[PDB]
């Protein structure tokens, strides 16, 4: 934390942050989600960290270059150690990209590695080749180089995931699934577990060992798993929670601008809300049905009447303010809401829909106030627009990313924030055989124009492509957009670090700190 002159520190360095819900895992190579990342990002340290405005910067790597954007070679500062007095070597990023890259770790992110394109990937997931082989070495203890299969400029930005985080051989290998348990995990961030009481509370303690561990302030954080968006701004505003999680309440929101104006954050974010269709069952493997769904959903309704907290509507996947998004705006967007009912019925009508045989799915979304509530306005809307009929169902959120994973659903509630801040961290995730692809969508021309993204050397061009990428899954129908989302959460007057100016909200602990008050 870089505290300003001047400013003078509470006694006790503590925070409390609401998380969301309760963590899919601790172990960096098995988690998924924004809820996972927060804690992740205090306790796991990669070759780069973000700073406080998001910019890519040095983390376990000091220093870094590379030759024609296919070979980086990281320089490891000498004083990077883990929480029981250990040095962090490169050998640590060696077995730790290898082991998320192995098929046996199942790791919802070993695709990451195929988004940057480290060498020999798509034989390792494919069991084809050891993991072992993955392209990369430790040329030394402290240099880390990786080796890609083909020019990638933006390769660094990628680091900062928690994926990518090392994660220690030693404890893995002693104690399996539950190394991860107070009492055996070994951690290099600014942080270390102190407790984890599942469904109440995840309490981080400073690591002494941090290299920069004489710039931490905060001595503890509480992380809360409080699916309630409602529950979290009431116990932020008893005095129990400093800050809250980022999805705010239908219920209290208006309120809240008007009530405490300074502590309602509202900035920038690179995520897109959505409705996942599951493009392999039937009838959702129709695209007149797709079409029809994403067309008879009013945006206006749901973006400006039901939820109003300064969402944009959504006709894309990749949100239009990434960096290299150049995207074409479809015309259906622009046609008013009824143009867009007639032509879903007409879809609906022609794939074999009546009203004695109407169309009936399930809509499941993770546990909370708000997605209920928009759940249930989108079920209204596609009953009154489109005569379908919708089963709400809620599942608690690490069993939720389970039955997407699965492929145990019709359509979900679903929200993608970018890794990185490029278009492919978001048109990745739709590649045929992508780790990440939830929606299991299969196009080969949507991953014949991906691939051919870092067969060019010009920006322009791949700006080209990902457009055309975009329209080719609007053209399918892979998705429903609904809306881009800001990041609005409550922060306490008193927290001092947080500027809110990373769209991609890579917060970490060690750089805030508690104004006395």
Same mark, same amino acid.
């Given at each position: ?63 870094? *270059? ?16 883990? !929480?029981?007095?250990? &040095?962090?070597?490169?050998?640590? %990023? ?27 990937? +798509? +034989? ?19 240099? %880390? ?5 083909? &020019?990638?400029?933006? %390769? ?8 990518? !985080?090392?994660? &220690?051989?030693?404890?893995? *290998?002693?104690?399996?699934? #539950? ?25 981080? *303690? ?56 300074? *502590?309602?954050?509202? +900035? ?36 400006? @009447? ?22 074409? $705006?479809?015309?259906? %967007? ?23 045989? &109407? ?73 045929? +055989? ?13 991953? @014949? ?20 990428? $975009? ?5 399918? !129908? ?31 602990? #060690? ?7």
């Amino acid at each position: 934390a870089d505290v300003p002159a001047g400013v003078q520190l509470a006694d006790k360095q503590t925070l409390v942050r609401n998380n969301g819900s309760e963590v899919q895992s601790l172990d960096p190579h098995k988690i998924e989600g924004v809820p996972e990342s927060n804690v992740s990002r205090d306790l796991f340290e990669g070759l780069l960290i973000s700073d406080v405005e998001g910019h890519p910067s040095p983390g376990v790597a000091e220093k870094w *270059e590379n030759k024609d954007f296919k070979v980086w070679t990281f320089h490891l500062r000498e004083n990077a150690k883990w !929480s029981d007095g250990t &040095p962090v070597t490169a050998h640590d %990023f060696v077995y730790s990209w290898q082991r998320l890259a192995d098929p046996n770790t199942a790791s919802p992110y070993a695709s990451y590695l195929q988004y940057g394109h480290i060498a020999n990937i +798509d +034989d390792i997931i494919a069991g084809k080749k050891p993991a072992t082989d993955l392209g990369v070495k430790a040329l030394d203890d402290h240099t %880390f180089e990786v080796t890609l299969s083909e &020019p990638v400029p933006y %390769f660094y930005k990628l680091l900062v995931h928690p994926s990518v !985080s090392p994660v &220690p051989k030693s404890a893995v *290998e002693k104690f399996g699934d #539950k190394w991860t348990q107070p009492a055996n995990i070994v951690t290099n961030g600014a942080y270390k577990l102190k407790n984890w009481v599942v469904n109440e509370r995840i309490v981080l *303690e400073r690591n002494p060992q941090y290299w920069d561990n004489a710039k931490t302030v905060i001595n503890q954080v509480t992380y809360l798993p409080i699916s309630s968006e409602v529950t979290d701004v009431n116990r932020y505003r008893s005095g129990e929670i400093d800050m809250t999680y980022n999805n705010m309440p239908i219920e209290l929101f208006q309120k809240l601008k008007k009530e405490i104006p300074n *502590e309602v954050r509202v +900035d920038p974010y690179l995520c897109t809300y959505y409705y996942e269709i599951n493009n392999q069952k039937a009838p959702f493997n129709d695209v007149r049905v797709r079409t029809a769904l994403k067309l008879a959903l009013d945006r206006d309704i749901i973006v400006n @009447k039901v939820k109003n907290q300064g969402d944009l509507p959504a006709y894309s996947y990749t949100p239009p303010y990434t960096d290299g998004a150049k995207l074409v $705006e479809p015309e259906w %967007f622009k046609w008013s809401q009824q143009k867009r009912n007639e032509e879903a019925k007409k879809l609906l009508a022609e794939a074999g829909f009546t009203a004695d045989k &109407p169309l009936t799915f399930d809509l499941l979304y993770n546990t909370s106030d708000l997605h209920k509530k928009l759940a249930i306005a989108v079920a209204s809307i596609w009953k009154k627009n489109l005569g379908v009929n919708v089963n709400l169902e809620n599942q608690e959120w690490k069993t939720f990313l389970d039955t997407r994973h699965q492929g145990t659903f019709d359509v979900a509630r679903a929200g993608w924030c970018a890794d990185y801040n490029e278009p492919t961290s978001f048109l990745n995730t739709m590649l045929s +055989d992508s780790s990440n692809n939830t929606a299991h969508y299969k196009s080969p021309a949507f991953d @014949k124009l991906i691939a051919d993204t870092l067969k060019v050397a010009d920006d322009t061009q791949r700006s080209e492509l990902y457009a055309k990428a $975009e329209q080719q899954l609007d053209k399918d !129908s892979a998705i429903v957009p609904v809306y881009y989302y800001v990041n609005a959460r409550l922060v306490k007057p008193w927290v001092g670090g947080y500027t809110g100016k990373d769209p991609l909200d890579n917060i970490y602990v #060690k750089n805030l700190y508690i104004i006395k008050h």
